[PDB]
Structure formats: structure tokens, C-alpha cells
Design a protein around this nucleic acid. Structure first.
Length: 214
RNA sequence: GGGAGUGAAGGAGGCUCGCGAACUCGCGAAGCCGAGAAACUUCACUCCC
């Protein structure tokens, strides 16, 4: 529908931006319409998987023991084993960094009551509260699912931002990445696809390219 | 599409200066903020003319 639009909208931002000493990632910003941001009414705190995903696999880490914690290493992930949970809670500088380094966290479920009490504080209101993992479960259907998961939270404000690619991936690829990010929209109450004002996209060190066609 | 502040998004970078007949090409132990939410690029909400 407005595919051609957003498509031109992004061809415009690839050169509308400077080369860099690393690679820029694409972000889409959205300006809402009529709501109140004050009602339980959807605030979008959901997460919906990205089709072609990013160019950068999300980063995961796990809190657990032995077997659960075993899936980790061979899976290439980083891991925080029990005792270190304390050792960390009394060393916040590191505690933090870790958090700014890993998109997601999964916990040996029965291990939350050590987490909340020890990693908790400097973790939760930073979006890093780790998700529980039942007893002895299989991780890949989720973890593997996550390397491409993208978050869509906004707290109480009529706007939002999400990643939807990386300078390395391709034009069209992003589109749908976005398109898809939008289906989130339609499902609520009655928010067709147009309950927002404008929409720009641009990457890390580039210009917020405008919303329309030509 | 002048500036303030606050918020949230991407982020490991960003930016100056010197020498060669040399714009962003080469050479430079030359310097300045940053990977601590706070550098850099932004968007929006309340301002200020």
C-alpha cells in the first residue's frame, strides 16, 4: 500500500547519511494520533519477531545451573552462574555494562528470588529484567527466536522507536522488517494503519528522513 | 528545519589540527569529547524570542 512510499523513504536515507568508521543501523520512529497514554489501553510493551531481522544478532545471556547453563556455551552465549549473581550485585559498574551489552536475559526460573533481590535494582528499569526458563527446558526455539526479536515499548507517550535493520542488510529487506513491525498496530481496538501522524527512518549517524512519497 | 530543558531511540565512536602541489587520498606517537544514561546522530512533549 504505502510500500513504495517507505521504500523511497529509505533509499533517500542511505545516502542522506555519511559513511562511518563502523556500520549504521536503521531506526523507524512513529508519532501517534488520538489516544491518552494514560489508560491501560495498549501502550505497546510487546515484542514482535523480525523476519529478516537485524544484521546484528541480538545478544543473549543466561542465568542458570549446569544443564540449563550448559546449553549456553556450545550455543555461543555468555553466562552468569549462581554465585556470580551475588559477586555482581556488589559490583554494579560491571553489573551495568553487562546489561548494556545484552539485548535479552533468560533465568533459571527458580532463580528469580535471587535475581530480583541481587541483580534486580540496576537491571529492571533499564528493560533488562530476564525472562524465566522453566525447570529443564529446551532453549533454542526461544533463544534462536530472539536473535531476531525486536522490542516495541514506549511507556506513556504518543511515539515510539524500534530497530529494523542495519546498513549492511538490504533496502526492501528493511521495508517488511518495518511493515511487519506495524501489524502490531492494527490488532488493538480500531487502529487501522493510519492512527499516526508522520514517520521517519534513518540510521545511527544519519538524518531523520521524512514520512512520504514523491 | 534559531536556541533551553526534560524524555526516550540508535551508538562505539565522533571531532579538530600538521606535512604533501594535498578537501574529505596518503603520511602524522599532534590535540579534544566518547563506549560511566550521559560523545555523535535523532525524534517529541513543555518552553524562549
Amino acid at each position: 500500500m504505502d510500500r513504495e512510499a517507505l521504500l523511497q523513504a529509505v533509499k533517500e536515507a542511505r545516502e542522506l547519511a555519511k559513511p562511518r568508521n563502523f556500520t549504521q543501523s536503521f531506526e523507524f520512529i512513529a508519532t501517534l494520533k488520538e489516544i491518552d497514554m494514560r489508560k491501560p489501553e495498549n501502550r505497546i510493551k510487546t515484542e514482535v519477531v523480525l523476519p529478516h531481522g537485524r544484521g546484528k544478532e541480538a545478544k543473549i545471556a543466561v542465568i542458570g545451573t549446569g544443564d540449563l547453563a550448559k546449553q549456553a556455551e556450545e550455543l555461543g552465549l555468555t553466562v552468569i552462574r549462581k554465585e556470580e549473581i551475588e559477586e555482581l550485585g556488589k559490583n554494579k559498574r560491571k553489573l551495568r555494562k553487562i546489561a548494556k551489552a545484552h539485548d535479552f536475559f533468560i533465568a533459571q526460573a527458580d532463580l528469580m528470588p535471587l535475581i530480583g533481590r541481587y541483580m534486580g535494582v540496576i537491571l529492571g528499569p533499564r528493560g533488562k529484567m530476564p525472562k524465566p526458563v522453566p525447570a529443564n527446558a529446551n532453549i533454542k526455539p526461544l533463544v534462536e527466536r530472539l536473535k531476531k526479536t525486536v522490542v516495541i515499548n514506549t511507556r506513556d507517550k504518543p511515539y515510539f522507536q524500534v530497530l529494523v535493520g542495519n546498513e549492511k542488510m538490504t533496502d526492501e529487506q528493511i521495508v517488511d522488517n518495518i511493515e511487519a513491525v506495524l501489524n502490531v498496530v492494527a490488532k488493538k481496538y480500531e487502529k487501522g494503519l493510519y492512527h499516526i501522524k508522520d514517520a521517519y527512518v534513518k540510521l545511527t549517524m544519519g538524518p531523520a528522513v521524512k514520512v512520504k512519497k514523491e
